[PDB]
Amino acid sequence: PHRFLPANVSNRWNEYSSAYLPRV
Amino acid sequence: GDLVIASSEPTQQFRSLTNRWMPINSIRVTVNGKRNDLLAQYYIPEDFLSTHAKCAPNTIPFETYVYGKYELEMKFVANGNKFQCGKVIISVKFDSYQADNINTGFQAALSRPHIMLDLSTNNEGVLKIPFRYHRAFVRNQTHKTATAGVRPGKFASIYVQVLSPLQTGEGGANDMFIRPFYRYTRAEFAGMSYKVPLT
Amino acid sequence: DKPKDVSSITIIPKPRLGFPHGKGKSDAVAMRVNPVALTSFQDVSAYPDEPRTTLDIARIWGLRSTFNWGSGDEHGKELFNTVLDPGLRFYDQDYEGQITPMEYVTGLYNFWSGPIELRFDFVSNAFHTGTVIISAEYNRSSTNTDECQSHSTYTKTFHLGEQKSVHFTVPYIYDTVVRRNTASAYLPVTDYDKVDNVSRAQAMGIRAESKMRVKVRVVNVLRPVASTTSTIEVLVYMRGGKNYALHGLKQSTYWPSNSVVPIDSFPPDGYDP
Amino acid sequence: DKPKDVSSITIIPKPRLGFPHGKGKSDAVAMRVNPVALTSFQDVSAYPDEPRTTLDIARIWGLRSTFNWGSGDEHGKELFNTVLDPGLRFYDQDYEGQITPMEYVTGLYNFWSGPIELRFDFVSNAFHTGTVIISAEYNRSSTNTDECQSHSTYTKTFHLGEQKSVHFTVPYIYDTVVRRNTASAYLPVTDYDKVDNVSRAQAMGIRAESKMRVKVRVVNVLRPVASTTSTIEVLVYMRGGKNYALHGLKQSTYWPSNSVVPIDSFPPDGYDP
């Protein structure tokens, strides 16, 4: 159950948001 | 090579608009920042169209043309005092779509094309970005009528990362600022259409 | 004398030679008296006007579609509007009819590229008059009621009068050097099986549907004399451009739908009445 | 006529040709129309700045380690001390992090040789001042408190001031022409199996641990002005020398530890939501 990321850290296109710097 | 085949009609340049320097958002570096931390990151051209410098005349041709090839140049200007010290690294990752979360460390940055900024000397750095993409063109804009099968406006990623943390003296400033500037060295546009607002 | 033969070499044995290829080498044994004798094409041979390649067949003009243009059709109105994809005519319904030569032959390949040519024949007389605008629209499509969106693309305006025909090369403007076919590479369904999501999930590939459209809009409303017809038919022909390309042989998307009967043993299978 | 063929030769049949080798001959059959047709690299080809060999990747500078140097650090004190072995970073603990290019690529080979280059970048300003001594120590190692032992080896003293960087070639001085890798040639353990002596006894080989060390000691104590920081970080970069050599391909000692997910069937395996 990891088929898409949570909405807090994502840009519509179901990828890591450019705003969310803490991903690293 | 692929340009003449991919587009039956000729491609166009608008050097007066696109090949000028344009500043983007300011970057804050603090003493709290650790090595490998992202200070900023940019998915290009997307982020230079619809987030940073949205009213720039550099963005005007992207309204009408659907495709293009893009070679960029990015200057970085730092302003820390002589009693501070630290190292920042800026690097580029070509065709980064769904591969931003891997090979994304300081070590990967040192391997890929990059520039190094000392925060005390305030040396300027200029990284050159060629067009290295798995297709002939990159798409400029999404649209309601357009397909969602191809994610547009991203052929590369730029990372600004801490190499060595910012340090300061007793009763010194706990932060300092860096300003990026961008320009297209070679922006060829293809596939004319009706003008639309950017994102 | 009977001296020993010391010559030798390592070999890799294969059952067939040049089995996958259309050209090169062959190990075929002739069922003839003379093993190197071949068929003579001295008198009886292929005629010079016959097509030699699939691209030659694609260069034949074929009637794709038709539409009507009347005096009631107000300015800016879409007379014609289609996704011009040589892979498939429809994405959302079955096709049955006389497909064009270039579409038939393109159905044999997984990839296509290069410009596509159109020709609009107006079935009219000298007393018919009007103007239309042909437009090639890529990536982003126009609204039906917004003529201005169509005008901003690659267009050709035709003044209908004494001349009753106009040619139009549709440019190839895409993000890739070639486009993959929207039809399937392989389809084992033969008996019109009722499809489900599991069948689609276990398909050969994913259909990359084209958003590239060709449209024809009214510029000046058709104003014929009272003595002639108020509405005319327009025939839309299509063929591959001079630099049309095809690659990647696959299962044919189209197959005969009329007068299909499999062969039987003649005369064993009840031919003797 | 049908005359007999008396020509013959003895042969040794093999199933594959050039199966172990990276170059030479191949008996590969092309899945093409033309059996001798190949991919075109006329327009799309490898960029000239890209590395062509493993040695080219080893010539890229990579940040190995970091250490702090303060005004409290008395003379003779070890600021830095490590066994410089490109095979393994540690012999007595697990590693996890961003390994340098030359270490990553050396992990693919059973043997290495030639000098190793280091670069010490002092993250400081003009108001920082001091002196350190870099030393390459072979066979016999020095005591932590005995600076004189380090001084008797191959050394380079650097006066920190306006210049904030120093290069150091570590000589190759060993009893053998090449050194074998301290990592394993083959390791079938995949599920973090709890090791015993019987497992170690039935290993692929024996780890020939290096005693060659690079150290950095204080010569003159760091004496910065009161207005600036009293402690600075020093970045230690590493790469292979110009005559760095690698040989004997093996199982990679390093493997990705972040965002590792195996592939599944798309779209059969629950992609359709």
Added chain:
Amino acid sequence: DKPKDVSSITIIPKPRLGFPHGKGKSDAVAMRVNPVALTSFQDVSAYPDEPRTTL
């Protein structure tokens, strides 16, 4: 074109080549990257005072 290959010859298949012999021909496959690469005796080689034959 795909013309037929009419060339052929009779052969006697053997499992090994030059198995009994100390010299001549060999069908040995090198366990190397380069299949024709060999050991270098440029620096390290047999000393001249060493015996070359049983005699």
Added chain:
Amino acid sequence: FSDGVTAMGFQSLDTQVSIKDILRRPVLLFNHVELDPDYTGFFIPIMPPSRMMQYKSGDKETSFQRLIGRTPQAAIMNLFRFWRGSLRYTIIIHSTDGHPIYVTHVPHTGNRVYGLMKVNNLHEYTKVPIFGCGLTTEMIIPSVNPSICVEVPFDTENNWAVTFDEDAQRNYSWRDKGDTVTGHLVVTPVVSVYMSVWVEAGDDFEVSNFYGPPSVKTNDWNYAFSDEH
């Protein structure tokens, strides 16, 4: 507007546009069909793949492969009603035994049959084999090689062979009925064994009498997802 530049040669030099090149790559006819020694042999009518061998849902079950009609070269042959020259048949026997399997060529005799058949409805053919009657024959020895490729000549009275008819099962003038083939290829075993058969055009081969594209149907769209789910 500009004609642009061709994509031919950009990806690779392996051009697949030539009609002859398309017809020269093989088509499976029979997939694991039985040979029975009680019969004369398994007959293969010498003709290229076309609409003549097309399966239609509902009709009687044949030994032929169902997707012959949907192959590129079958689609090409549906455009040309004339063909002249040799065909090449790749036959694979599913065995490793030392029994010889004979492949006999019959020239144009005027009939058109396929599959296992008892010639003149006898119940014994080991004493009177078709391969030992005088006709040109070749043997397969599976222990050595289970496959073979044989090239059959254009031994017929006519200038061209007829590719197809409107109705393949119509009982019309008997001499004209047989002009769609140039002969037969007959496979005879010792004991019961299975085989597979491919066909392709020879090097000496031509097509002519272009008919243009027929009326066709497709339902490929229905068995695939789009790029937008």
Added chain:
Amino acid sequence: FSDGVTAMGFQSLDTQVSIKDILRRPVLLFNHVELDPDYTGFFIPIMPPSRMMQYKSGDKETSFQRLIGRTPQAAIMNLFRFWRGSLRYTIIIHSTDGHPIYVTHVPHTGNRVYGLMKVNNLHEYTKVPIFGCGLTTEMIIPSVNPSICVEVPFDTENNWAVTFDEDAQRNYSWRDKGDTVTGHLVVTPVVSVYMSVWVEAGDDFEVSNFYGPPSVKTNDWNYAFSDEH
């Protein structure tokens, strides 16, 4: 200090530093996996070895070899996100039977699958085999030779094929999802039989788009004695 003299050429002239030479030596993918004739065939996605095929302790069991990720060439491909040209697949059938096993090439259709699959979820494929649909195919006859080496072309729309993604199981834009392969290689038997599969780069092959080394882990030290007991 002196740069010295290189050791290259001292031991032997067999240089193993060239990236292309490393990628051209084979990697085992599948070790003794079953082919079943109830399915269309065993699919092999045309892509080089990389982190995409890496095993992680705990995850679901696949048919892939576990140590693909730890091979030299997999480690090399983790540095380059672009590749163009042909790959070579060595397939060995564990049999000595006379049954033909067909290997069919499928060009870039946009999907990405592996293992046994029923295409369009049917329950019969002997009458409609993938190898007799029109696509390029080659046969293995184990009685003659149980092994084969086939070279698959770069039949795709894209300039480069994408080597890897950050997450291989992420459901993103479907057209982009399939750009990590250039097609498929499908093995179809007559009867149930096992096979093994290797992969290597072709002669016509290039890599580009250097990404540098990723974050890695090792525990090799723990499973070995030192030279001092």
